[PDB]
């Protein structure tokens, strides 16, 4: 995007990532890297060791801190100090975090300059409209019994894999797929992502996925009609451009964070067809009723409410019964799943061998 929008020649632009670490030899140039590639102190590669000296030796003129909501974290702020720059800028959609370090940005890069409304841009055609919803899926009795006795650490996995969520997701996916909508399913738990993906036979991406494979998956999901839905995880929570994505679903969450909810929603806010008449994006949040998810759900969506988004409670999904088949529809499958999830917790002697 950098090259597309400006007239900078590719020769003067250098990329500093894990694949390639070469640095520009020009008098003036641009370096695009990640904080983890510059905040490391103990150990660095020989190729990276020269790059670290290359960054430190020169006196830069401007530093752009993309996603500046993580610069006040433990150590990414070191790049701001180690890297010499006469001006510092911060870019983040959500200027909030659980701790009080958010205020540290004032003396790190300066105060907040400008802010923009969300609903104002929605009505002006700049961004798409979202029909936010929250589905309350009552956990089945058999699983709920283990929920009471089980410890907090294991409790999370129990109500995230309840059979009701599987059936609701299948009906929504089929209904939305029939409508020609691109669906993204977020899940912080890797095990749930794999189980959902393999059960539904859909691609999934998470931490272990390599850069090459995921890039091919993302390109296929954008332009390939056969692949209309994917299964992303916390890795794709933010900073990945999906101009084609329109629908968004989430099954798991990272407790009470109010930024992840907004960051995840951003995947469908840059949809290409955000100006055609009557278009409204969808954001479904599957939460198990009568569980701690409501405490986190009501606490992790407070930021979006302030912006202007309103979540709609959906107690019933019409037409769910008429669907031909649903996962874990019989008690036998539910019992099998219950135990499955529960069980989760001398150089010449060289010829000898």
């Amino acid at each position: 995007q950098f090259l597309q929008w400006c007239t900078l020649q590719p020769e003067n632009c250098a990329v500093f990532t894990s694949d390639n670490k070469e640095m520009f030899q020009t008098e003036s140039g641009l370096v695009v890297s990640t904080y983890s590639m510059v905040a490391n102190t103990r150990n660095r590669s020989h190729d990276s060791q020269k790059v670290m000296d290359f960054l430190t030796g020169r006196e830069w003129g401007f530093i752009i801190l993309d996603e500046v909501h993580v610069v006040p974290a433990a150590m990414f702020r070191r790049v701001v100090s180690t890297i010499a720059a006469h001006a510092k800028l911060g870019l983040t959609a959500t200027l909030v975090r659980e701790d009080d370090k958010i205020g540290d940005l004032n003396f790190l890069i300066g105060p907040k300059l400008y802010e923009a409304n969300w609903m104002e841009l929605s009505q002006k055609g700049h961004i798409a409209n979202v029909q936010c919803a929250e589905v309350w899926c009552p956990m089945t009795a058999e699983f709920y019994q283990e929920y009471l006795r089980e410890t907090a650490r294991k409790r999370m996995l129990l109500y995230i894999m309840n059979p009701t969520k599987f059936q609701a997701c299948q009906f929504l996916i089929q209904y939305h797929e029939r409508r020609g909508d691109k669906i993204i399913v977020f899940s912080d738990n890797v095990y749930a992502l794999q189980e959902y993906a393999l059960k539904m036979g859909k691609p999934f991406i998470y931490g272990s996925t390599p850069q090459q494979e995921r890039m091919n998956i993302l390109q296929n999901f954008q332009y390939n009609d056969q692949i209309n839905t994917i299964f992303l995880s916390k890795v794709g929570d933010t900073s990945i451009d999906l101009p084609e994505a329109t629908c968004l679903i989430q099954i798991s969450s990272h407790y009470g964070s109010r930024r992840q909810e907004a960051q995840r929603l951003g995947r469908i806010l840059r949809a290409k067809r955000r100006n055609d008449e009557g278009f409204n994006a969808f954001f479904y949040s599957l939460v198990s009723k009568d569980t701690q998810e409501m405490y986190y759900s009501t606490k992790r969506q407070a930021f979006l409410v302030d912006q202007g988004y309103a979540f709609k409670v959906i107690t019933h999904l019409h037409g769910m019964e008429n669907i031909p088949n649903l996962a874990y529809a019989s008690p036998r499958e539910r019992r099998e799943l219950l135990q499955e999830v529960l069980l989760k917790n001398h150089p010449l002697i060289r010829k000898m061998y």
Binding site: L348, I349, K351, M352, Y353
Partner: protein, 106 residues
Amino acid sequence: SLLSFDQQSPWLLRLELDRAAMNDKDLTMGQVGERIKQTFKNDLFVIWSEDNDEKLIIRCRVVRPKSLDAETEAEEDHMLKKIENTMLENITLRGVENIERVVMMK
């Protein structure tokens, strides 16, 4: 009695040494034994008789690894011949290379 051996290979290599040959050059079984034991640091276990014995013999056994090799049994004796030949040629018991003999003169 004075003293791993469970997996020691049943095959044995026996070397007989001449006292008249070993007293021409001042050597003891201690230095030659450790020289063999240090050539292969701990691969093979060896025992040497004392000088007081009527005949000087060193018994050597190669210990197989934890994994059992069935294909090596056919060449097990062949491997012993291989090490036996090397143990005679490329072993520098003591001295400097390329020095075949030395004579004292006045």
